[PDB]
Amino acid sequence: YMKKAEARLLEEQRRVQVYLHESTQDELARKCEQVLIEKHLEIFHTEFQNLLDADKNEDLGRMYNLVSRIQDGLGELKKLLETHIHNQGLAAIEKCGEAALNDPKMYVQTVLDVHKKYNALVMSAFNNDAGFVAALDKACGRFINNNAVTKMAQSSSKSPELLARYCDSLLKKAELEDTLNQVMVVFKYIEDKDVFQKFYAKMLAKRLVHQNSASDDAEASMISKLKQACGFEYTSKLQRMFQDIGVSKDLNEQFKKHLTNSEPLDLDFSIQVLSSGSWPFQQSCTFALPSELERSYQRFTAFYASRHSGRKLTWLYQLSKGELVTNCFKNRYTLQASTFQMAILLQYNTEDAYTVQQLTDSTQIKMDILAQVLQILLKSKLLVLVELKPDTLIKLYLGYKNKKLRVNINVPMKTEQKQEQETTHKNIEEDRKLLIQAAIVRIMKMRKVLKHQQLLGEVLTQLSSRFKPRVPVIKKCIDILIEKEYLERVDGEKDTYSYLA
């Protein structure tokens, strides 16, 4: 019937132009459009839903062409398309199950496929109309920030974290540009951008310290995209770390040229010296340095004290790795391990059996960390004896073999990921509170006396580009600012605040 209607309209145009008068054109066209289209809108809407259910783009384009002639006839189609896209996104996310809670690639690819399909539909069939683009944008923003995955985590902050983890997986060790651009397209619909920024910065720091990046060009491209989307302070914060890496490289070169004019060291030594205020790392736990490593420690400490005067160095032993070569086994193996592992293997350098309490006393490692690293060692078949006790006996296992000479045992412990995620979420909440307080203080400094609702409106306007604050948190920040002698409640004219010097 749609094709029949279009053909009839063309035929009527031909008739009126060929053998009628010019004054009849508009009225005849209006009546024909009325009779042929406006009387069957109820059928057209159901057909629209059915055609959306089973992908038929040509029919959708024809119907869009037909209904566009009727005044104010495209609103119902826009609403139906928005609802359909929202439902499709929700269903696509829900089908992934619980696996999508700990698989960033699956989540992001599902979102990207839905968005690609409906963007192509909007451009091809609806002639890139503004209302349909707006409907697609609203549906995408609705189902990206609230879905089955977010309900399981009981927080809408899971989506930015998954996106950041997907980016980290992409940039770790030609088609990468397209997926980075698509990710940045997804980033526009996210409301809690600060979570994404924090997670991305932390994982970029981890990548830079351990020197595991696919390429520097990919990092530069991602930084440029973040420049385009985010502000200017965030990129400056990242460039600080990027500069510290180069400073450390230059210092390593200077140290190497300094070691030639002295006694050479037994081992190969590299260091990454970083500023304490520009990196997300915390101080290490108690640890007694292995007896084979004080030489490099003292030499570098003396060199740094010579080159820089008023600075002091703190050593992060949880982020340090190395190589251990073994010879008292079946064959020559070389293994990669962390400083904690190197310390707790060389304790029984010539001995064969220790008690974990004695190991605790020798290595000065706490309970949980030592237990986890010992479990990791036991799972590697390198060491032989589930629960552990201070009196447990653990002994070296001789004659173990592996299919490859190069073996790595620096596998991450399971609990650290969850603990780090919880810690950074708590840090994000505290930072949110601090920025809300700062915004309120600054606004009161500008305007001496202001009302409650205007204060809230200006705070949300100022903080909108990063996150959407909650009003109870704003009240709590106002209350904690009143106590700290920053602003005071004026006598009379209730619900009004004035700045106090």
Q: For the segment 413-452, give every residue that binds other proteins (CB under 8 A).
A: 427, 430-431, 433-434, 441-443, 445-446
274 binds other proteins (CB under 8 A): yes
**C-alpha to C-alpha distance for 8 and 137, rounded to whole angstroms:** 36
Q: How far is the CB of 208 from other proteins (least distance, A)?
A: 11
Distance CA 244, CA 233 (A): 17
- Residue 81, both tokens: 């398309």
By CB under 8 A, tell whether 346 contacts other proteins: yes
Of 39-47, 191-199, 262-270, 449-457, the window that binds other proteins (rule: CB under 8 A) is 262-270
How many CA atoms does the CB half-sphere of 179 hold within 13 Å?
Answer: 14
| Contact stretch for other proteins (CB under 8 A) within 50-58, 82-90, 138-146, 316-324 | 316-324
Taking CB under 8 A as the criterion, the residue among 227, 381, 448, 470 binding other proteins is: 227
What's the rounded Cα separation, in Å, for the pair 79 and 47?
A: 15
**Cα torsion 452, 456, 457, 459: sign:** positive
Q: Is 236 near other proteins (CB under 8 A)?
A: yes
Task: Supply the minimum distance, in Å, between the C-beta of residue 315 and other proteins.
Answer: 5
Relative to beta strand 406-408, strand 487-489 is unpaired
- Report the alpha-carbon distance of residue 207 to residue 446 in Å, rounded: 42
The residue (of 56 and 138) whose beta carbon lies closer to other proteins is: 56
Question: Residues 42, 72, 250, 266: which binds other proteins (CB under 8 A)?
Answer: 266
Q: Which stretch binds other proteins (CB under 8 A): 34-42, 156-164, 194-202, 322-330?
A: 322-330
| Shortest distance in whole angstroms from residue 277 CB to other proteins | 4
> What are the φ/ψ torsions at residue 293 (nearest 5 degrees)?
-125, 0
Tell the smallest beta-carbon distance from residue 202 to other proteins (Å). 13
Partnered with residue 384 across adjacent β-strands are: 395
Breaks, C-N > 2.5 A, in the chain lie after 173, 385
Are 124 and 134 a contacting pair, CB within 8 Å? no
Q: Taking the mean position of all CA atoms in its chain, how far away is CA 276?
A: 23
SS (H, E, C) 181-196: HHHHHHHCCCCCHHHH
Whole-angstrom distance, CA of residue 345 vs CA of residue 325: 12
Residue 188 CB, nearest distance to other proteins (Å)? 16
DSSP state of 263: P
Task: Please report whether residue 312 would count as binding other proteins according to CB under 8 A.
Answer: yes
322 binds other proteins (CB under 8 A): yes
Q: Which position among 3, 8, 188, 311 is part of the footprint of other proteins (CB under 8 A)?
A: 311
Evaluate whether 279 touches 205 at the Cβ level (below 8 Å). yes
Polymer length of the chain: 501
Query: How many Å apart are CA 32 and CA 53, to the nearest integer?
Result: 30
Q: Name the residue with tokens 């054109």.
A: 25
By the rule CB under 8 A, 467 interacts with other proteins: no
Q: Does 201 bind other proteins (CB under 8 A)?
A: no
State the binding string over 74-93 for other proteins (x if CB under 8 A, else -). -----------------x--
Tell me whether residue 135 or residue 342 sits nearer to other proteins (CB atom): 342
Q: Provide, rounded to whole angstroms, the least separation between the CB of residue 168 and other proteins.
A: 19
The reply on whether position 239 binds other proteins by CB under 8 A is yes
By the rule CB under 8 A, 157 interacts with other proteins = no
Cβ nearer to other proteins, comparing 320 with 355: 320
> Does residue number 65 form part of the binding site for other proteins (CB under 8 A)?
no
Which residue in the block uniquely carries the two structure tokens 């909440």?
429
Q: Is 362 in the site for other proteins (CB under 8 A)?
A: no
Nearer to other proteins, 5 or 319 (CB): 319
Nearer to other proteins, 135 or 481 (CB): 481
Secondary structure class of 334 (helix, strand, coil):
strand
In the complex with other proteins, the residue whose CB is nearer, 115 or 198, is 198
